[PDB]
Design a protein around this ligand. Structure first.
Ligand SMILES: CCCCCCCC
Lengths: 62, 151, 38, 38, 54
């Protein structure tokens, strides 16, 4: 019947729209992940460099 | 006795499930408590370097263990929240963590498992395919959770 | 016969249920937006 | 025709999937109840 | 008072251990665990009755 086909079409369209929105949300999650990774690299570099260039002299004196 | 009570909790982090969202609270609290008691002892004993107290050595060893546990818990949480839309599970990860290590640790992954008519058929097919893809994604997420549990 | 009407009724109920869920989600998102604005 | 059979199979798959999901949810609620009792 | 505080501290440590175990039981599912029949028999039938859980 017309009601059945209309309902099935609406359900399919609703699922498609939800999928599209979920895709954009996953994109935002991936962007946050990338920002976190780049700052992980930077902070590891800074931490090691500082801990080797500011606690090296204490061994030189002691 | 306070130190013994605090040390008894240093291992509970590895039994806490990753979904409860409270591993960091526990392990960080344990580390801070141990550090506080180490500082109190340091205020009680003389500041000499001829030897270390045994209790101080024990507290130091426990603190190092708990720092290691915090790093491991961060890694386990990272593994737990992985999905097919951000990571791909390497075949060796499967081979090892889902098959071999579980057997060694006695765990056993359970592994649970007129145009209107044509338009309706297309819509039903789309719904079925959509649910199939969702099921596959859920299965992979479950695999990532299981790998975290094994670690 | 009766099966056709029963199936049509079930499909109509499913569609109405999804519409209601969509409206509820929309209003929840409106509340979230108000919180962000404040 | 072929489309009718494809739609029938899709509907059957959907029903079976939801049935399995209900079973899994039931087991999860059993675990939750056990924790509550303890 | 010191004795009472020490006793309560031991009890609270026990409660933390029990809370970790309870949380572990709560977050179980067929995808990763299987409920043994005795667990069903005890914790869904007998113990709930003794506690008037219903
Ligand atoms: C006619 C198929 C309807 C399926 C609805 C699924 C809702 C999660």
């Amino acid at each position: 019947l017309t009601r059945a086909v209309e309902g099935v079409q609406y359900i399919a369209d609703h699922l498609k729209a939800e999928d599209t929105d979920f895709s954009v949300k996953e994109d935002w999650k991936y962007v946050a992940m990338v920002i976190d990774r780049i700052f992980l690299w930077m902070f590891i570099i800074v931490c090691l460099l500082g801990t080797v260039g500011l606690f090296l002299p204490p061994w030189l004196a002691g | 006795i306070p130190c013994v009570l605090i040390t008894s909790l240093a291992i509970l982090v590895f039994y806490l499930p990753s979904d409860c969202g409270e591993k960091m609270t526990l392990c960080i609290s344990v580390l801070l408590a141990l550090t506080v008691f180490l500082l109190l002892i340091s205020k009680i004993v003389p500041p000499t370097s001829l030897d270390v107290p045994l209790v101080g050595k024990y507290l130091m060893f426990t603190m190092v263990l708990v720092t290691f546990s915090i790093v491991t818990s961060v890694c386990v949480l990272n593994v737990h929240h992985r999905s097919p839309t951000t990571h791909t599970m390497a075949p060796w990860v499967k081979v090892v963590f889902l098959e071999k290590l579980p057997a060694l640790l006695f765990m056993q992954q359970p592994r649970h498992h007129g145009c209107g008519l044509r338009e309706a058929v297309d819509g039903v097919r789309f719904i079925a395919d959509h649910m199939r893809s969702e099921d596959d994604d859920q299965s992979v997420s479950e695999d990532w959770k299981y790998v975290a549990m094994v670690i």
